[PDB]
Amino acid sequence: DLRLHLLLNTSVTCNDGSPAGYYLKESRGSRRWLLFLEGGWYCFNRENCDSRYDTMRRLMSSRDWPRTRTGTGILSSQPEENPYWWNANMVFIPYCSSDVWSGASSKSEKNEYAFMGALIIQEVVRELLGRGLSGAKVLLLAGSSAGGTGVLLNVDRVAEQLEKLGYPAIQVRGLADSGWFLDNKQYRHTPTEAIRRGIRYWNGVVPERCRRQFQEGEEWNCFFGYKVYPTLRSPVFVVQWLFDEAQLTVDNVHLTGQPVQEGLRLYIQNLGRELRHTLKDVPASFAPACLSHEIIIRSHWTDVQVKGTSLPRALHCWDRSLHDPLKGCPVHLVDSCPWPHCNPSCPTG
């Protein structure tokens, strides 16, 4: 179990002004620290955020958070469930800012909600330094879905923060799961505009080099992995289902069970091909040909394999690669088969 700590800096808040926080399970014998960013979509205007506050309030407020959370998947402390980092210090950072971890705006006379995701990450890091993070060798910033995009948006800022605080020995790395989206055409008209609106509403911030490339008004581009990733300095391992359910949802694709006809077949095959293409120059990546969403905190995350290598193994090979290609220890694992579940190890249900 990971135990809740609300932030001592109570100016760093969830959407409704309640304190943000983190769940922590320390491992005194380890210099590895895993900080996991929870996902859960986002909201981009008053009306949409008001609706989220009615029925997704734990994603907007700490008032009802439990005192503990069980660590699962990569956050598990059991080697059987987590062959990769079972002995690490484990941190789960609840997503309560609804801003894809990009916001830096407080609740105020003019703002019904606070959007402080980027500040939450930095405040968590600062408060952890006194609880052992100061002695870390590796800080792995991981996250799923909106948290995976949050990794891409924040990993270099965490690195810069620790450098400026005087901890140059801590190696900051990223693990972005299910946060690598395509700004593609929908299958039918009903994602780019939502982020453009959100950035303004949240006072959202993006990594500096990416911001300098795209410039004012175009920072929404930095929420798309294939555009922001090449600008990043920190090592980032990208985990992405080729047929991610959230991608298909934003693309207005709903697979019932009737025979898929040619237009949709071509659409789905093209989506997988495009995703594969965007990963070709990502040296640390795990991209199975499955219709699914998220993996790293699922208890059965050990089961999927690409080219016979599981994700925990690929992450271990990545660790080895960052010591100083490895025989039988691959780090770039992208399926080439073109249809969901052409990989036999894909999740079932």
Ligand SMILES: Nc1nc2ccc(OC(F)(F)F)cc2s1
């Ligand atoms: N460029 C984009 N980044 C994100 C991050 C999270 C998100 O919510 C979802 F549930 F789809 F993951 C959508 C998008 S679009």
Ligand SMILES: *[C@@H]1O[C@H](CO)[C@@H](O)[C@H](O)[C@H]1NC(C)=O
């Ligand atoms: C608390 O957080 C705010 C917002 O990030 C920051 O401006 C302020 O310096 C912090 N105060 C302390 C004591 O850490």
